[PDB]
Design an enzyme around this catalytic site. Sequence first.
Site, PDB file in Angstrom:
ATOM      1  N   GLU A 178      -4.058   6.438  12.862  1.00 31.72           N
ATOM      2  CA  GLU A 178      -3.687   5.038  12.685  1.00 31.72           C
ATOM      3  C   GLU A 178      -2.185   4.875  12.846  1.00 31.72           C
ATOM      4  OE1 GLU A 178      -4.656   3.155   8.993  1.00 31.72           O
ATOM      5  OE2 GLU A 178      -3.863   1.232   9.655  1.00 31.72           O
ATOM      6  N   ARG A 179      -1.773   4.142  13.889  1.00 33.91           N
ATOM      7  CA  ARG A 179      -0.517   3.382  13.947  1.00 33.91           C
ATOM      8  C   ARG A 179       0.717   4.250  13.683  1.00 33.91           C
ATOM      9  NH1 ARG A 179      -4.126  -0.332  11.545  1.00 33.91           N
ATOM     10  NH2 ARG A 179      -4.481  -2.195  12.821  1.00 33.91           N
ATOM     11  N   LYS A 182       0.828  -1.199   0.000  1.00 37.56           N
ATOM     12  CA  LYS A 182       0.000   0.000   0.000  1.00 37.56           C
ATOM     13  C   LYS A 182       0.862   1.249   0.000  1.00 37.56           C
ATOM     14  CE  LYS A 182      -1.922   1.462   3.776  1.00 37.56           C
ATOM     15  NZ  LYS A 182      -2.768   1.503   4.996  1.00 37.56           N
TER      16      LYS A 182
END
Lengths: 469, 470, 471, 72, 57, 72
Positions: free
Chosen positions: B189-190, B163
């Site tokens: 996110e993360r 990705k």
Amino acid sequence: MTRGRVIQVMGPVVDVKFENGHLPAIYNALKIQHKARNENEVDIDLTLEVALHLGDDTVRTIAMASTDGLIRGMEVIDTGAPISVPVGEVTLGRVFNVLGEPIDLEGDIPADARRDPIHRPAPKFEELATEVEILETGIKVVDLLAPYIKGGKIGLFGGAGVGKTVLIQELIHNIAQEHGGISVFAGVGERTREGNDLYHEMKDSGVISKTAMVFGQMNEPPGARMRVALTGLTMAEYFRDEQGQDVLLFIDNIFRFTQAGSEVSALLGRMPSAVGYQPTLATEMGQLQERITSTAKGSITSIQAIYVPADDYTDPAPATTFSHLDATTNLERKLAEMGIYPAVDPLASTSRALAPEIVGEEHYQVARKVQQTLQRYKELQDIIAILGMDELSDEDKLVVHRARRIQFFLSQNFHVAEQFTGQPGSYVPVKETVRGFKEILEGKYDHLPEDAFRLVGRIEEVVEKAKAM
Amino acid sequence: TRGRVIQVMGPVVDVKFENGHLPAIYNALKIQHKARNENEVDIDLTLEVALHLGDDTVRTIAMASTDGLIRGMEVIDTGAPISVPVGEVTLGRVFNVLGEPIDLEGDIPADARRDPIHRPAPKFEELATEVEILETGIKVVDLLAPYIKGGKIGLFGGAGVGKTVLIQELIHNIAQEHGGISVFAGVGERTREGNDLYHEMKDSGVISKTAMVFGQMNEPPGARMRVALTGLTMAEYFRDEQGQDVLLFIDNIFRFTQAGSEVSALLGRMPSAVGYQPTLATEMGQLQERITSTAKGSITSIQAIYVPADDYTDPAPATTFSHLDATTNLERKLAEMGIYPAVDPLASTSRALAPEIVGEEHYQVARKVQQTLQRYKELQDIIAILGMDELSDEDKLVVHRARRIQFFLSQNFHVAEQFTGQPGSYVPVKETVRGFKEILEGKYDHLPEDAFRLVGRIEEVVEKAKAMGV
Amino acid sequence: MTRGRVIQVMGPVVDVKFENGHLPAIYNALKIQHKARNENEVDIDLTLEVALHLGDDTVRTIAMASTDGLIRGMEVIDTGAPISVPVGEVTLGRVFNVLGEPIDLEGDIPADARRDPIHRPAPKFEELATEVEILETGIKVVDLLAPYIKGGKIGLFGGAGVGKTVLIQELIHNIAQEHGGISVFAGVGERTREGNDLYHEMKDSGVISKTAMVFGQMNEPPGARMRVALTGLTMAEYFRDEQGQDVLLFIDNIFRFTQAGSEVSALLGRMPSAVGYQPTLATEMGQLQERITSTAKGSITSIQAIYVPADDYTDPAPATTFSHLDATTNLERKLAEMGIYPAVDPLASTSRALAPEIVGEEHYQVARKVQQTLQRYKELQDIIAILGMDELSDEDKLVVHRARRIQFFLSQNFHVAEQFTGQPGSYVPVKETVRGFKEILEGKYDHLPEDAFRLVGRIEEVVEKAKAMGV
Amino acid sequence: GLSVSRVGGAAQIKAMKKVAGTLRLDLAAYRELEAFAQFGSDLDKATQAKLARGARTVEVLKQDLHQPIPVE
Amino acid sequence: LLDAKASEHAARMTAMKNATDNANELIRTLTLSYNRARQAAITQEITEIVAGANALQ
Amino acid sequence: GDIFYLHSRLLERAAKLSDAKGGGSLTALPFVETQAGDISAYIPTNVISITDGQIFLQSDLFFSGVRPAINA
Ligand SMILES: Nc1ncnc2c1ncn2[C@@H]1O[C@H](COP(=O)(O)OP(=O)(O)O)[C@@H](O)[C@H]1O
Ligand SMILES: [Mg+2]
């Protein structure tokens, strides 16, 4: 003095404040006639049903029409009674809303007419009828396989091109012909163009002169759709009580009653019950369907359409209607495409009254032999499909040869279908259809061709139709 | 014109200003408080006005943590919403929710231009009339799921699939052949993955064209709500002023919705169906209707989507999918098979794949590619169990052409030059339609099953195949 | 001299208001004793326990009996302590209600007896004992697959009418005579006739006079049923602390504790928790269940029946109590409708003592191979349901052919179930059930029919039942 | 199969990496082809060879309680 | 052998007919379970929504 | 509570008038978007129960190539 002020308007819910001690009772009607005094206002004719007492002299009402234009401080008439709806011979052949006002353009009902309250307690234990007697319709599939009851609740399962309106209309014609009663159609929450089509069908079939229509349809607020079956039922109750006759009471899509009650409960701010239904689902359904009873005076027997949402017969809105039903007449598309009218599925249609202690031993044995013969024919359908019509056995060929004669003798010529087919139509009393099906089962009419049995009333009439062919 | 803190309720702070001097909704409010003794903590917040309560009371959302707040701290009204620096200054930099550099390259001076986060969407009379296609130079994208210029793309991809490589090559190709800035926005996110993505930017070299904004899971939900609007504010400068075709990556756009669902329960709102806020689709459209192609520029948007529990009937993926124009569904089967980019050809669909937008030849070529790949997908159990010999020919030709099609769908990326040495390619749409048409005609069935792997155009297939002696 | 008035009465829940600075602590006991001045009043003898503080000197209590007759303004006496329950050697052979009062009509306990308070904190870390050793029960599923622990918590999960009261009576019949130490029975929300039957079989089998019984049956308002198990527990923990005795404790339906908490939680002013339960569904049960421990002074081996509502194991009150237990047996309605009694799910039932270092090596291999064949048969259920036994590949036919036999040799005839069927019932030692299941796994009994294995103690009785069937 | 490692491969040492890369392929092939060996019609010799490979992979990946293995 | 092939195809016909009957009985029991579960889902979600609405007042 | 009333007072304004009222007509075409093809939701069942029949556009027929994907 009973003149009140509007305090809150929020959607279909209106809060009205009266003086102390002059509060209206629950379920009373509250009229608002306000003519606009300037260009900044709107003319309003609007009625309200009292639903709660909130305290601080305030009353929470539900609305029967659109609340747009209401001003906080607009004054409200207390009528001192629930929604009083005209009753009598002035209602037969007329179309009405939930307020007892004519949708028709024929004319207004005058002010001196008798008006009965929409909310009545159910008839007492001492007033009911002790014996279960059969409402005789003259439709052979009805009064032979799923027999009706004076004071019974019956579920029409079908719709959309299986002959529901024709069955309804023939029921009105037969009951008002032979039993002398009238009918009342209460269209609860069903769409306007089907009400128009049903009006013109009963207009050009002559059925409408012996019935009264009440339409409370989709474009109306939920408080207006919830009270439709009650204002058709209070028209049926006049002819049950004052006239003492046996009345039909049609409620098209009884599920719309339950979901309109759910919507009024969600507007009233109540905590929801199982699934999405009101807490008072069984209580509202009981207050509806315990006034559909048989008394010593007369009866009200109601034929009702049930939607059964999500194909789920255990959903609470089917499950609380089914605790009041007594018979089901499953209308099938397959029997309508086969040429059988009415399209009542004989095996799916059940009744509580089909029992030897109610109808008799002869009717019970003939009806159960008809049901066993048709069930074995439905089982032999696959053997005829994979093997052919012949070479099954002798007994299987004989039971097919009797069952096909049975399933075509079930259809009738209706009086309502006389305008389409030309033949006059027949009322078949229940002793003659028991005798006819017993004679078909005993093999008295095996030698006649099976297309003489289709669409004919009695068994003498299939004798003359077979000798005429 | 100061106000004092009334309540501190998690991420939500109630502030009372003086009468007549209330701040407008969405304005930024700042608390610079110095600890007067050892019983206090130095705090530094930016509060965003969300509501107006009754008696001169304002309910705000904190962009940082509210621990250490005292009921009575003075609150400073900025007179404006969260002003984010925009321009050429922001290129090559990683930013906060408030428009502040996280990296240690310095700070942006006070005389720079700062635009407000909250802006109306472009009007109906300002948008583009025809659907144009944003040409990426990726053969799966340009053939089977075309990206419209000014539209919204969904990436369905976990990890180990590529990705991030696909993101940085979209950045590379747009900045090369379109002159278009990309703007990355990491919405909750993360932080580990945001660090990995930033160092892949530094290694690939596509950091010089990307402005980055991170507010991750470690931040309170107002910050995670406003990250995507900060990054969109940075991209709208280039669209409006520079007239460019701008990319705008939002990683896990689902977190934008669930940050609103975390904020709204504390604001005092009744819960909507499925536990979501009542203003779900409204604040979704006030984000994404700012992503349009106007007359002078464009912002196209590739948006990673984590559907929770693969439930596509959930309200937040429903309101996200109502705005999408194409999907590019990344699958690990194609990544372990060797096909980079690992875009599923059959699951990745588009709204542009229609003959008015792409043409008739492109539509029929991509349609025949989809038909032969669907026919190859519905033979997989037969090939894997029964075998190739029992395959009932006129299907063996289908597998013969479908292997060569699904290997020609992979490219050599410009980004992966540092890992392989192969220089990378930008393939136009006419050449990839001609190449897949020539594979579907059967012109290159005599070539081996390889030499389609990791090539740009169709002449590179025959030069790689004669490089192997064929 | 400081007494309080009744402010609110809402079902089981009473508000009492005291003077300023004289309100009780949480969990203290409050007595209402009213004299019924005129015709419009009723004599009342209520005990209230404090649950909350509300401010303005008011106190939110939970009644231990029915509140029918309480008038607002009625005077409440503070006692200055929690519900104190008599304990000692005087509780052996007696039957008690929730207030610690004897209900067996054999007398009244004197006022100078020792009364421990109900509400005490749990035993700490350094006090506990973590020895693991098998409690032998004579039940084949329990001995083979989920071995009970002498001194650990034991849970009997089941639905409604599935067999956990029969299983608790079978464990009383197999353990309570052999135990040689004090037993305690707490009946929380079970039937009142099951307290009569159990008392009379304790009288007939002589296990009374080394047994202390406490009943809080399902007729009682929920303030009683929240405290019954605590009365039985303070009776047991007196023995294991002050005497160092080995104590059996039996609680039938400790689910009724959390359900009685749920019935009061709405009236206490709390928001609804998961489903219809209190928010405190885990700490109210943790402050109970973690007092039922084995310490350095003595051990309490507690066998607890746990009701499961609507046969839903994912419900919060069955789910939050799996983490408390050492060994469980999960009863299934699907097995009880197959005639398999005890209807113990052989896969879902676990123990902390099914380890090779405890039950031995051979026991462990027989248990794990039994579970492996039953898991493979559960996997083959769908192929058997649609396509039948015909398509299985000749080892799966052997798996099914052995797993029917294993599933039916888990069922057993009970001594307690003699009144149900007439069959006298068995007691299978651990070596013999391991030998019997090993001989079934070896293929020694494939030739016998599968209906010859139902409701049979040992494997020679399988042989003689198949002989009487005619094989 | 369902257990995902998101860092994975960068975590492992090189000796674990070289051989886990084909362990995963062997076990995924066993998971894919064990579905067609439940009933029916007796898969051929190559599919049964990799079913035996996968069953020995499953027997390798078992351990006992509280005895870890070093990396080597 | 011809008699055996005829009985083979008849036995496979009967086996697949019994398989469809078993599958359809599984369909009707699973739709009963589906209706119970969708009912429980509707009432659980509306209990949550109205609890969150009553929490505010 | 009045979300059925909301769509019904909208969709009952679409009428074929009589020839006394002029003879004009209003025919309506509402659209309802569903997620993964469930029509057992609340707003789909409301608008299906209001309107005079329906037209199903499946995504399975659209994906397979049947365009327009009208499930007859
Ligand atoms: N071991 C057994 N043998 C035969 N029947 C049993 C056995 N265990 C339970 N049953 C049957 O199942 C029912 C379960 O009863 P019981 O255990 O008292 O209720 P609950 O399981 O709800 O506590 C009993 O009435 C009995 O008929
Ligand atoms: Mg019990």
